[model samples]
Target: EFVEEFNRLKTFANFPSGSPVSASTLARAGFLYTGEGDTVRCFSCHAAVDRWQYGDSAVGRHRKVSPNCRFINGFYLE
Candidate 1:
């Protein structure tokens, strides 16, 4: 369901325009989907519209987290 939800959100994010995910849905997505941040929550990074970046997205070097990062190394390596 994580990827499903991710793809769903990604799809919505890809949409040319929308009202943006509700705060409740954004919270659910961050906690249940991306698993970003500690207690600060994913919104702290992705922002309310899923358009901003707080973690690796700011660097704009990788699609997501860098492969060198401990948390995302496995995913990138795999």
Candidate 2:
């Protein structure tokens, strides 16, 4: 149901069928679907990661960039 909810968010539709932004990755990372496909914002920091690069790991990058984010810092643990 996590994937379904993540995919149901209209914002995630910006990526094609084979994009790296998967519901499992982002959802698990505590990224809320904002209904704007191209934008991936952190639920804790509220930091927006709009530009997605090919072969980029959204979860990994988020942790690297925003180390203070609770979701990535072992706070949410979702």
lDDT of 2: 0.63
Error of 2 at 59 (Å): 1.6
lDDT string, candidate 1, 11-55, tens digits: 332222232333234333442223332211222233222343334
Off by over 4 Å in 2: 1-18
Candidate 2 vs. truth: CA RMSD? 4.3
Clashing pairs in 2: 11-35, 11-36, 11-37, 12-37
Give one digit per residue, the lDDT tens place, for model 2 in 16-70: 4554577556656666656565566776777777666678787777887788876
Using all chains and alpha carbons, the TM-scores for the candidates as numbered come to 0.20, 0.64
